[PDB]
Paper text:
Here we further characterized the PAM recognized by AceCas9 and report crystal structures of AceCas9 without its HNH domain (AceCas9–ΔHNH) bound with a guide RNA and DNA targets. Similar to other Cas9, AceCas9 contains the conserved RuvC domain that is connected by the arginine-rich bridge helix (BH) to the nucleic acid recognition domain (REC) and the PAM-interacting domain (PID). Unlike other Cas9, AceCas9 functions at an elevated temperature, interacts with its specific RNA partner, and recognizes the unique 5′-NNNCC-3′ PAM. We show that AceCas9 contacts the 5′-NNNCC-3′ PAM by forming a network of hydrogen bonds with both the cytosine and guanine bases.
Finally, to directly observe the impact of PAM sequence on AceCas9 interactions, we co-crystalized AceCas9, sgRNA94, and a DNA target containing the 5′-NNNTC-3′ PAM, or C4*T mutant, under a nearly identical condition as that of the wild-type complex. The C4*T (TC PAM) crystal diffracted to 3.61 Å and has a shorter b-axis than that of the wild-type complex crystal (112 versus 119 Å), indicating a structural change in the complex. While a non-PAM sequence in a dsDNA likely prevents unwinding and subsequent formation of the R-loop, the artificially constructed C4*T oligos lacking the paired protospacer helix in our co-crystallization studies are attached to AceCas9 RNP largely via the guide-TS heteroduplex, which allowed us to examine how the TC PAM may interact with AceCas9 PID. Superimposing of the refined C4*T to that of the wild-type complex structure revealed rotations of both the PAM DNA helix and the REC2 domain toward each other. As a result, the three residues that contact the PAM in the wild-type complex shifted up to 5.5 Å away from the 5′-NNNTC-3′ PAM. We infer that should AceCas9 encounters a dsDNA with the TC PAM, it would have a weak interaction with TC, thus preventing local unwinding and cleavage of the dsDNA substrate. Mutation of the 5′-NNNCC-3′ to 5′-NNNTC-3′ severely impaired AceCas9 activity and destabilized the AceCas9–PAM interaction.
Numbering used by the authors: 7 to 203, 210 to 410, 419 to 518, 682 to 778, 791 to 1133
The structure:
RNA sequence: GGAUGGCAAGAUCCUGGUAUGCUGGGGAGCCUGAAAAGGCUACCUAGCAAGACCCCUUCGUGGGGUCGCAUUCUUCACCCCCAGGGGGUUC
DNA sequence: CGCCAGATATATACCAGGATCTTGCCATCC
DNA sequence: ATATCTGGCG
C-alpha cells in the first residue's frame, strides 16, 4: 500500500513549533516537495502566566488532594488517641475565637490544680496545634525533631523585632502567648504574613518551625506535670508526618533484567562490580603483547582496591606498587571488544566508597556504634550487601538496633542510582571472577545476548517526561509513520534545533537512530544550532520574499520569525545537508562575522549547489500553490479543569417576587429551574428570555411544585451570583471552565441560512453526566438546565426549540478556517486596513467570546513577533513601518468575529489536517474537514 | 577529533509538608448608620475539583482504602508493539 | 439601549531532597 | 491568554 520513492526527512525543531518536510531526490537533486508543514504546538504549558507545564499543574493538584486526605487522616488518628486520653477538641460552631491560644498560654504560665478542668483546656490547645503544626524537613523523623534547638534562632529573632516596635517583652515567651496579646493592643494585626497583589503593621516575619512548636509542647508538659508514657505518645501523634519516598515506577529498569530495578550507587554489589569489571578488561604487555591478567595477579590487585579506605591507589601505583611491573605503561585497559586502549596513570583507581564511609563513621563514632562496630567487624559482605541495599531503601523508601540507628543518620552515604539492578551486578561479578572473562562477554554467559550488545536505545513510542520535547516528539513520529506509509523510508534525516533544547537533541536523535537501525536509514544528522538559516541565505532563499510579505521595522530587516511557515521551509532545505557540508557552511559563516570576506567554494559546497540549485524554484512553486501548511493539533480528550477554583456565595430570590430574564437563568436548583421554565412557556423545552427584562410578573402567590416538596410564595430559591455560566460544587457556586469545544447549529434556507454557536464547557459534560466511557462528547443532547443552554444565543435557542436548528458540525480551539480564494468578504473596520497589508485567508479558532462571536487569529503569523511589536511602539515610536502599527494594534485581541458574519461563507471550509499536513476529506474514524454552509446531519 | 577520572551548574518531574486564599459554619474587636444590618480588620472550625470505584460490613444507608486537571486526532473503527499497557491511521 | 474597544479577573507562594536528564569546566592517556 | 466586566459610543 506504499508508493516507494527516494526521499529525505527534514525537521526544524522550534520552541513552540516544529517544521517537517519530506523531499524526494532523483540522483542526485531534489525534484518534488512531497510534504512540508510546520505544526504549532503549545510547548506543554498549561498556565500561560508563570509558565508551569500541564503535568506540573496535575501533580500539584494531585499532591494537594493527598495532602488534604493525609491531613484529614492524621487529625482523626490524633482525635482517636486523645479520646481514651480524656481530652476535648474545639467544636466548630460556637466557641471563643481565642480559646486555643489562651489555653497554650495559661498552661505555660499558671499550674491549674483541678484535674478535670485541666483536661478540657488540654484538648482545645492540642487540636489547634495539630491544625497549625508548622514546617520541618520531611526527611527527618519525630525523634530528630526532638533533638533540635528548642526554640530556634529565627523565633528568638522574630520575638526581638516585636519587642523593639511595640515596646513589650513577654516571659518566657512561647508563640501561643505572643499571639493572644498582640491581637489586643493594636487590633487587626495579622500573625503570619501573606501577599495577594498596603497600609498596616504585621506581627511576624518568618514561618514557625515544628521545633519551636515542640518547644512549647514540652514546656507545658513540664509545668503541668505529665507522665512520660502519655506525653511521648501524644507528641509522636501530633507531629506524625508521613515519611517521603520515591515511587517504584520512577526507578529505571535494568536493561538486562527488566524485572528488577536499578540498584543504588552506595550498593556493595555495585562497588565490587565496578572494581571486578575494571580489572577483567586490563591487559599487560607480553611481547608483542598483549594478554589479560593472570588469575592470581587479578585477585591480588582486586583485594588491594577493596581494602583501601581512601582513593589513593592510582593506575600507576597498580602497575608498580602491587604487581611490581617494570614500567607504568606496561599495563593498559580496553573499553570495547578488542579495541583501542588508554589509561591515565595519574588518575585514581576505584575503591569501595560505601565500606570506607562505613569505616570512617565507625572510626569516628564508635561510642555511638559499639555493638555494630563489633558486629560489622566479622560480618561478611554477603550480608552487608543486603544490609546496604536496605540502607539505601531506608534513606529512601522503600536486624537493626533502634538505639544505634538514630546516630547512624550523621553518616553520608553515596546518593544516586546506577545503570544495573542488584542481582544483575551480583551475577555478573561472580562470572567475571570465576571464568576470567570480559564484562561484555559476562553478559553472554549470564543472559541470552549476542556479543557485544549496547543497551537498547529509547524508542519513538516512549515519552521523555519533558513537556517541550514530548510535544515535538509526538508530532514527529506521527509525521514519520504517515510518511513511511505514504512513501518509502527516507535516505537521510536532518534535524535543526533553535540551552533547554540540549536534552531534545540527544533524546530525539537517539530515538531516531533506533528508528533507522530498525527501518534501515543510512544517515542521521543533527545540528546545533544555526546551520539552516545560513543554508538559505547562501542560496538566495529569503522567506520574506518567498511569500510576498511587507517589512515591519523602520530599518529594513529579514522578517524570519514573522511567518510561521518558515519552520517547514527550513525543514525542506535541511534535506540537502550532510554533516560535513553543514559545518563547512557554518565555518564560513563565522569567517564573516569576525572580520575579508571573500566568497565560498569547496568540493563539498560546489557539489551541494549543483545538486541544490533547483530548490530556488521549487519553493516558489510550492508557495504559489499554497502547499506549505500551518497546523495545530486538536484537544479532544474531555479531561482538565472542570471549573474555576473560586468558590462563591449564592444569591437568594423569593418565589413570590418579580423575575427578570437574568434572574431566571441564575436559578440554581435544576428542578426549580424547570419549574420557572414552565412558568415562562408551558410547552417549551428551553428558556427563550432576554435578561434585563421582566418575563414573569410579581405574582404575590407564586408556587413551585417539585418531586421533593412544593415551595410557598414566601420560600426562597438560591441563585448563582452572576449571569454567567456556572455550576454548584460542594455547596458553592463556581464559574465554568473555558470552553472544551463548540457545537455548530444552523437553520433557515439552504441558500441563505443563519448559523450560531453553542459554547460547551467541561462543566457541562460533568453535570450532564456525559463523562462515562462510550460517550461522544460533541454530539449528545445537553439538558436545558446545563449552562451551555442557559447562555446560548437567544435566536439560537428559539430556532432549536422550533425543531429548525440541527447540529451540523463542531469546532474546537486550533482547527483551520480556509476561506478559499474567495477570502474574507465581510471585511469591515480595522480588519479592512489589516488585509491591505497582511492578505490572510487562513485563520485559527482561539476562543468563543460570547454566544454570538468567535475569536480568530491569523494562521500564518506568529504571536511572538507581533508582541515584540506592541512593546516597540510604546517605547520607541516612529520606528516601525505603517504595517507595523497595523499589526501592533491588531494582535492583542486579534479578531473578534460575529459567528453569523463568519459561517455565512459557502465558501469557507474548516480544515482538519493529517500528520503530513494534508486535509482529511474522507469521513473516516479520524476527524475530518467539512463545510459549515452545505454540511448536513446524518 | 575519540577514551577515562573528577568538578560545577542548570532542566524536568516526583514525594511529603507549611502558610495563605475562597466558600460554609462561627464570633474577638471596630466603623459607617436615629435605626434594622451590615462591612471592616482579624481569628476558630470544615472542605477545596465533579466524581468513579473498592475494601470491611457488625448491614452502620454507614466506617477506610485508593484513583480523579498528564500522555493535544474524545467515543466508535483497524494496523502495530511487549496480557495488560504503549503506538500509528496516508486524502 | 446595541455594539465596539479598552480594561479586568483568573488561587499563590514557599520548603528538603529523591528519580530522570543535559550542559559547562578541569585533567591525563591514545 | 481568555471570558468576563465596565464605560463610553453611536
Amino acid at each position: 500500500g506504499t508508493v516507494p520513492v527516494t526521499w529525505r526527512l527534514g525537521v526544524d525543531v522550534g520552541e513552540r513549533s516544529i517544521g517537517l518536510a519530506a523531499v524526494s531526490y532523483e540522483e542526485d537533486k531534489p525534484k518534488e516537495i512531497l510534504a512540508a508543514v510546520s505544526w504549532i504546538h503549545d510547548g506543554g504549558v498549561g498556565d500561560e502566566r508563570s509558565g508551569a507545564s500541564r503535568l506540573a499543574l496535575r501533580g500539584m493538584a494531585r499532591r494537594a488532594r493527598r495532602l488534604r486526605r493525609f491531613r484529614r487522616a492524621r487529625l482523626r488518628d490524633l482525635d482517636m488517641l486523645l479520646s481514651e486520653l480524656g481530652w476535648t477538641p474545639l467544636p466548630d460552631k460556637n466557641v471563643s475565637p481565642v480559646d486555643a491560644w489562651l489555653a497554650r498560654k495559661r498552661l505555660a504560665e499558671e499550674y491549674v490544680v483541678d484535674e478535670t478542668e485541666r483536661r478540657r483546656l488540654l484538648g482545645y490547645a492540642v487540636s489547634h496545634m495539630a491544625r497549625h503544626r508548622g514546617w520541618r524537613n520531611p526527611w527527618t523523623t519525630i525523634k530528630d525533631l526532638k533533638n533540635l534547638p528548642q526554640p530556634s534562632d529565627s523565633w528568638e529573632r522574630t520575638r526581638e523585632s516585636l519587642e523593639a516596635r511595640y515596646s513589650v517583652s513577654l516571659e518566657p515567651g512561647t508563640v501561643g502567648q505572643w499571639a493572644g496579646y498582640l491581637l489586643q493592643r493594636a487590633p487587626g494585626i495579622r500573625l503570619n504574613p501573606t501577599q495577594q497583589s498596603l497600609s498596616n503593621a504585621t506581627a511576624f516575619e518568618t514561618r514557625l518551625r515544628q521545633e519551636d512548636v515542640l518547644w512549647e509542647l514540652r514546656c507545658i508538659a513540664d509545668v503541668q506535670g505529665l507522665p512520660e508514657d502519655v506525653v511521648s505518645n501524644v507528641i509522636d501523634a501530633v507531629f506524625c508526618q508521613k515519611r517521603p519516598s520515591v515511587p517504584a515506577e520512577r526507578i529505571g529498569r535494568d536493561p538486562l533484567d527488566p524485572s528488577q530495578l536499578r540498584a543504588s550507587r552506595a550498593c556493595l554489589e555495585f562497588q565490587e562490580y565496578r572494581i571486578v569489571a575494571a580489572v577483567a578488561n586490563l591487559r599487560i604487555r607480553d611481547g608483542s603483547g598483549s594478554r589479560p591478567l593472570s588469575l592470581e595477579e587479578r585477585n591480588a590487585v582486586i583485594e588491594a582496591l577493596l581494602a583501601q579506605t581512601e582513593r589513593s591507589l592510582t593506575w600507576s601505583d597498580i602497575a608498580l606498587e602491587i604487581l611490581k611491573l617494570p614500567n607504568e605503561s606496561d599495563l593498559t585497559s580496553v573499553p570495547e571488544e578488542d579495541g583501542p586502549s588508554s589509561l591515565a596513570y595519574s588518575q585514581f583507581a576505584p575503591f569501595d566508597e560505601t565500606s570506607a564511609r562505613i569505616a570512617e563513621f565507625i572510626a569516628k563514632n564508635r561510642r555511638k556504634i559499639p555493638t555494630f562496630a563489633q558486629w560489622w567487624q566479622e560480618q561478611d559482605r554477603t550480608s552487608r550487601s543486603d544490609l546496604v541495599a536496605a540502607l539505601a531503601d531506608n534513606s529512601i523508601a522503600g536486624h537493626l538496633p533502634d538505639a544505634e540507628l538514630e546516630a547512624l543518620e550523621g553518616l553520608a552515604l553515596p546518593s544516586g542510582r546506577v545503570a544495573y539492578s542488584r542481582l544483575t551486578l551480583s551475577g555478573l561479578t561472580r562470572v567475571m571472577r570465576d571464568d576470567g572473562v570480559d564484562v561484555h562477554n559476562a553478559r553472554k554467559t549470564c543472559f541470552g545476548v549476542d556479543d557485544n550488545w549496547r543497551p537498547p536505545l529509547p524508542a519513538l513510542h516512549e515519552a521523555t517526561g519533558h513537556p517541550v520535547v514530548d510535544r515535538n516528539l509526538a508530532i514527529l513520529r506521527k509525521f514519520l509513520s504517515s510518511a513511511t506509509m505514504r512513501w518509502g523510508p527516507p535516505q537521510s534525516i536532518v534535524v535543526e534545533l533553535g540551552s533547554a533544547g540540549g536534552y531534545a537533541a540527544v533524546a530525539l536523535r537517539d530515538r531516531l537512530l533506533s528508528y533507522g537501525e530498525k527501518n534501515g536509514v543510512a544517515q542521521v544528522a543533527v545540528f546545533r544550532g544555526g546551520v539552516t538559516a545560513e543554508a538559505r541565505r547562501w542560496l538566495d532563499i529569503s522567506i520574506e520574499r518567498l511569500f510576498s510579505r511587507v517589512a515591519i521595522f523602520a530599518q529594513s530587516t529579514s522578517t524570519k520569525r514573522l511567518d510561521r511557515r518558515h519552520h517547514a521551509v527550513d525543514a525542506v532545505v535541511l534535506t540537502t545537508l550532510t554533516p560535513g557540508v553543514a559545518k563547512t557552511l557554518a565555518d564560513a559563516r563565522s569567517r564573516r562575522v569576525s572580520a575579508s570576506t571573500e566568497e565560498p567554494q569547496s568540493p563539498a559546497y560546489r557539489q551541494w549547489k549543483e545538486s541544490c540549485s533547483g530548490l530556488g524554484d521549487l519553493l516558489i512553486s510550492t508557495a504559489a500553490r499554497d502547499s506549505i501548511a500551518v497546523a495545530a493539533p486538536l484537544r479532544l480528550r474531555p479531561t482538565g479543569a472542570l471549573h474555576e477554583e473560586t468558590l462563591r456565595a449564592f444569591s437568594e430570590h423569593t418565589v413570590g417576587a418579580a423575575w427578570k430574564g437574568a434572574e431566571l437563568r441564575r436559578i440554581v436548583e435544576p428542578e426549580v429551574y424547570a419549574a420557572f421554565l414552565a412558568l415562562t412557556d408551558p410547552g417549551g423545552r428551553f428558556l427563550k428570555v432576554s435578561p434585563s427584562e421582566d418575563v414573569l410578573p410579581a405574582d404575590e402567590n407564586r408556587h413551585i411544585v417539585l418531586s421533593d416538596r412544593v415551595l410557598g410564595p414566601r420560600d426562597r430559591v438560591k441563585l448563582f451570583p452572576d449571569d454567567r455560566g456556572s455550576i454548584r460544587v460542594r455547596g458553592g457556586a463556581a464559574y465554568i471552565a473555558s470552553f472544551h469545544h463548540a457545537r455548530v447549529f444552523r437553520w433557515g434556507s439552504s441558500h441563505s441560512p443563519s448559523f450560531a454557536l453553542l459554547r460547551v464547557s467541561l462543566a457541562d459534560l460533568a453535570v450532564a453526566g456525559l463523562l462515562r466511557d462510550g460517550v461522544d462528547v460533541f454530539t449528545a443532547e445537553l439538558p436545558p438546565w446545563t449552562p451551555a443552554w442557559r447562555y446560548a444565543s437567544i435566536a439560537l435557542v428559539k430556532a432549536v426549540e422550533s425543531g429548525d436548528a440541527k447540529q451540523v458540525g463542531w469546532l474546537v480551539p486550533g482547527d483551520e478556517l480556509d476561506f478559499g480564494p474567495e477570502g474574507v468578504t465581510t471585511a469591515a473596520g480595522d480588519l479592512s486596513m489589516f488585509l491591505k497589508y497582511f492578505p490572510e485567508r487562513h485563520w485559527v479558532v482561539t476562543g468563543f467570546e460570547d454566544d454570538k462571536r468567535i475569536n480568530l487569529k491569523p494562521a500564518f503569523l506568529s504571536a511572538e513577533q507581533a508582541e515584540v511589536l506592541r512593546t516597540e511602539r510604546s517605547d520607541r515610536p516612529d520606528t516601525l513601518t505603517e504595517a507595523g502599527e497595523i499589526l501592533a494594534q491588531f494582535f492583542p485581541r486579534c479578531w473578534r468575529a460575529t459567528v453569523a458574519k463568519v459561517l455565512c461563507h459557502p465558501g469557507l471550509t474548516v480544515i482538519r489536517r493529517t500528520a503530513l499536513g494534508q486535509p482529511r476529506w474522507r469521513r473516516g474514524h479520524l476527524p475530518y474537514s467539512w463545510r459549515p454552509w452545505s454540511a448536513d446531519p446524518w
